[PDB]
């Protein structure tokens, strides 16, 4: 009948998460938001008025006029699930702490934030295990393109041999647009307007966003507990880019060891990844029992990413 | 720990279903096959030896030397699930009868066969409802491309506004190859070699395979109970085909009524469907909360279709 959530972060993605929940509730499970924050304020309570919170955030830039000190402020209400739409920390410790607090409080977790899982996979899964809880992370790789839900429920009979995809938006948008002769400033301005740039855009340009995604992918698919120290990645540099250059993230096994690598590649015309449009993301998974499957979208933005977060909420409602 | 199945039909798709199950069991839930048939013979028992059955079918063309009269022959063993890999009947009545028997016997159903659902959706769902059982049908539209599992578990928050795809293989392969100047015989020979042609290949050429898929799609997505009488379809004709012609199946709402239409269309260069290779299938779903999602594969054959069937078996194991 109803799932109670706490939402941390109400920016590009988190405010859209509220919008989707509100639209969903109006069709009528029910998703009841019992706690919500931004960096400075919060709301907490049994019957929180989501459209009113959306309106107040849009108009004033704040969730409320009630100062937020940390996650502890939100643990006064019984909830089933914590949703993390906060920006990446440098080391993942803040996120680990949040998820651990959630798990110990009887909650599962849904996250769009990549830093906790990219840095602290081991400690996060240990706390999940010890508390008998779950974490889902659809939005952490290729925002709005179905990926982990596909791997979890569409190719159950298979071993995955390889993953290759365009999964980090801003770096790819930058490379493609600079190949057309645009300045970095202009492209970055467009990425911000679209809502796809990281809260720290240097994370995009140095390839760190892709790197984080590659950790989550390799650990998910091959069962490893790698960190950023174990993957290879590259950022944008001063080269003149070609029209067919893309920042491709690959996960596969080399000499019995899983590898995660993000690199700039000049793609062949017939590569599936070249079918992906300027505003989209996508990937290809090679499997041993379900063939080679290709998945992409047309426009991958914070709204679509929010839809991935809400899909995760609904998948966890059935546990 | 274990799911017990009965498999009806051990042709291109069904023998691969056994192969996948056997490979799966060797990695070690367990899928235990307690009944299996082809048109003339069957095996039934607690500890059936799948690799031995595969070998006997491959070598001799028969499952066993024990005459099969109908589904009743297989109901002596307790099972959780019936799998239908039999060919399409003209009217769906045989399939309805089979599923009804299964449901009443305490079993769920997984099917690759499109005719029951395309003709008898209402009666089949009624019997499922009345007996509190389920039916899954991943393999019935676009063999090995994940479709219903995507709609069920990857875009839960959304309303689907439209579906468009290349989902009927043989007719598309024929059109594309004849556009290259090949004779019908040569192309049909290749389709049979690949294992993608229907047991009655006229079902492919007159567009009936696509039509059946369109019924299943419109009923699944929009909640209707249409039959073949309610959809529009076309077959191959004597025209000279263009390089960009494809038989596209669309499902959408026109003036408040859902519509299902399969038709030959000359696609634009930038259409996602033009990214689909000669041996593949794929589609695009427009959604209101998860964007527009594209899904395809590289080689859609009876092995990949079998993998879709086994995914359905594994999804039902968790009920
Ligand atoms: N943009 C995209 O399409 C994609 C985003 N993601 C991930 O989603 C997450 C959110 O992205 P996005 O919404 O664009 O980011 P934003 O910067 O737009 O929003 C971040 C939100 O969290 C708040 N916040 C910042 N620091 C803290 C803090 N330490 N504790 C609590 N709240 C905090 C912000 O406060 P305030 O409103 O006061 O600024 C804001 O509400 C990121 O981790 C990102 O990597 C994943 C895939 C796609
Ligand atoms: N080929 C493909 O990739 C696709 C197939 N499908 C569907 O899968 C189903 C099977 O296709 P495919 O394996 O190619 O077909 P085949 O003709 O190769 O195999 C059919 C199997 O069923 C047996 N059979 C025929 N009639 C009956 C009967 N009335 N009762 C019990 N068994 C019977 C056949 O017997 P015997 O071995 O004695 O001939 C054979 O074992 C079809 O409905 C098809 O539409 C769906 C998507 C993709
Ligand atoms: Na995703
Ligand atoms: Na399918």
Dist. CA A210–CA A215, nearest whole Å = 9
Report the nearest atom of ligand 1 relative to the CA of A12. Answer: 13
Dist. CA B169–CA B187, nearest whole Å = 12
> Is A14 labeled as ligand-binding?
yes
B291 interfaces chain A, CB cutoff of 8 Å: yes
What is the DSSP secondary structure assignment for residue B63, as one 8-state letter? S
Question: Residue B284 — φ and ψ, nearest 5°?
Answer: -135, 130
**Residue ranges of the domains in chain A?**
1-145+299-319, 146-298
Dist. CA A156–CA B308, nearest whole Å = 9
Longest Cα pair distance anywhere in chain A, in angstroms?
57
Query: Experimental method used, please?
Result: X-ray
Neighbours of B26 (CB within 10 A): 8
Q: Which two tokens stand for residue A68?
A: 């937020």
Q: Which of B41, B74, B86 should be mutated for ligand 2, with most atoms under 8 A from CB?
A: B86
Q: List B297's β-bridge partners, or say none.
A: A293
Angle (CA) A63-A65-A69 rounded to 5° is: 80
Dist. CA B167–CA B235, nearest whole Å = 14
> Is B12 labeled as ligand-binding?
yes
What is the DSSP secondary structure assignment for residue B134, as one 8-state letter? -
Residue B184: name the closest of B170, B168, B169 by CA: B170
Which are the catalytic amino acids of B? 213
Residues of A in contact with B144 (CB under 8 A): 290-291
Q: What residues contact A5, with CB distance under 8 A and at least 6 apart?
A: A31, A32, A33, A34, A35, A79, A80, A81, A82, A83, A313
> Residues 233..272 of A with a Cβ closer than 8 Å to B: which?
272
Q: Are the beta carbons of A64 and A43 closer than 8 angstroms? A: yes
CATH topology of domain B1-145+299-319: Rossmann fold (3.40.50)
Q: What residues contact B99, with CB distance under 8 A and at least 6 apart?
A: B82, B84, B109, B111, B116, B124, B127, B128, B135
Q: What is the CATH number of domain A146-298?
A: 3.30.360.10
The three-state DSSP-derived secondary structure of A120-159 is HHHHHHHHHHHHCCCEECHHHCCCCCCCHHHHHHCCCCCC
The reply to whether residue A293 touches residue B24, judged by beta carbons under 8 angstroms, is no
What is the DSSP secondary structure assignment for residue B287, as one 8-state letter? E
Q: What residues contact B268, with CB distance under 8 A and at least 6 apart?
A: B244, B274
> Residues 19..78 of A with a Cβ closer than 8 Å to B: which?
20, 23-24, 27
**Residue A317 exposure: Cα atoms within 13 Å on the Cβ side:** 18
Cα–Cα separations (whole angstroms), residue B268 to A8, A32, B66, B86, B131: 43, 44, 54, 37, 47
> Is B13 labeled as ligand-binding?
yes
Q: Are the beta carbons of B48 and B76 closer than 8 angstroms? A: no
Q: Beta strands A108-111 and A42-44: pairing type? A: unpaired
B315 interfaces chain A, CB cutoff of 8 Å: yes
> Residues 109..168 of A with a Cβ closer than 8 Å to B: which?
144-146, 149-150, 152-159
The distance of A88 to chain B (nearest Cα, Å) reads 23
The reply to whether residue B146 touches residue A156, judged by beta carbons under 8 angstroms, is no
Q: Is B298 helix (H, G, I), strand (E, B) or coil?
A: coil
Dist. CA B293–CA B157, nearest whole Å = 14
B87 lines ligand 2 (CB under 6 A): yes
The distance of B237 to chain A (nearest Cα, Å) reads 30
Dist. CA A196–CA A177, nearest whole Å = 15
The reply to whether residue B157 touches residue A310, judged by beta carbons under 8 angstroms, is yes
CA B21 to chain centre: 18
Nearest CA to ligand 1 atom 24: A39
Q: Beta strands B108-111 and B81-84: pairing type? A: parallel
The three-state DSSP-derived secondary structure of chain A is CEEEEEEECCCHHHHHHHHHHHHHHHHCCEEEEEEEECCCEEEECCCCCHHHHHHHHHHHCCCCCCECCCHHHHCCCCCCEEEECCCCCCCCHHHHHHHHHHHHCCCEEEECCCHHHHHHHHHHHHHHHHHCCCEECHHHCCCCCCCHHHHHHCCCCCCEEEEEEECCHHHHHHHHHHHCCCCHHHHHHHHHHHCCCCCCCHHHHCCHHHHHHHHHHHHHHHCCCCCHHHCECCCCCCCCCCCCEEEEEEEEEECCEEEEEEEEEECCCCCHHHHCCCCCCEEEEEECCCCEEEEEECCCCHHHHHHHHHHHHHHHHCC
Q: Which of A194, A213, A269, A318 is catalytic?
A: A213
């Amino acid at each position: 009948k109803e799932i109670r959530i706490i939402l941390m972060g109400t920016g590009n993605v988190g405010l859209n998460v509220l919008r989707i929940i509100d639209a969903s509730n109006r069709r009528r499970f029910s998703i009841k938001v019992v706690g919500v924050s931004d960096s400075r304020s919060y709301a907490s309570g049994r019957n929180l008025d989501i459209s009113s919170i959306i309106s107040n955030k849009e108009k004033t830039g704040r969730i409320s006029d009630r100062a937020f000190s940390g996650p502890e402020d939100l643990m006064g209400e019984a909830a089933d699930l914590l949703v993390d739409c906060t920006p990446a920390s440098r080391d993942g410790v803040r996120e680990y702490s949040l998820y651990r607090m959630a798990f110990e409080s009887g909650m599962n977790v849904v996250t769009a934030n990549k830093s906790g899982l990219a840095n602290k996979w081991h400690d996060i899964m240990d706390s999940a295990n010890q508390n008998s809880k779950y974490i889902r992370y659809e939005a952490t790789v290729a925002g709005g393109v179905p990926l982990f839900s596909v791997l979890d429920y569409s190719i159950l009979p298979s071993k995955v041999k390889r993953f290759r995809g365009i999964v980090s938006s801003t770096i790819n948008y930058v490379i493609r647009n600079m190949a057309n002769g645009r300045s970095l400033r202009d492209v970055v301005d467009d990425a911000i307007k679209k809502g796809i740039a990281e809260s720290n855009p240097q994370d995009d340009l140095n390839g760190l966003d892709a790197a984080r995604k590659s950790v989550i992918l390799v650990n998910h698919i091959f069962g490893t507990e790698y960190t950023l120290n174990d993957v290879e990645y590259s950022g944008v540099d001063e080269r003149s880019y070609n029209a067919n250059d893309r920042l491709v993230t690959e996960v596969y096994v080399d000499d019995r060891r899983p590898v995660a690598v993000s690199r700039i590649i000049s793609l062949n015309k017939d590569d599936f990844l070249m079918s992906i449009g300027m505003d989209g993301l996508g990937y290809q998974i090679e499997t041993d029992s379900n063939g080679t499957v290709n998945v992409s979208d047309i426009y991958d933005g914070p709204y679509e990413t929010a839809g991935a977060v809400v899909n995760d909420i609904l998948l966890l409602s059935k546990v």
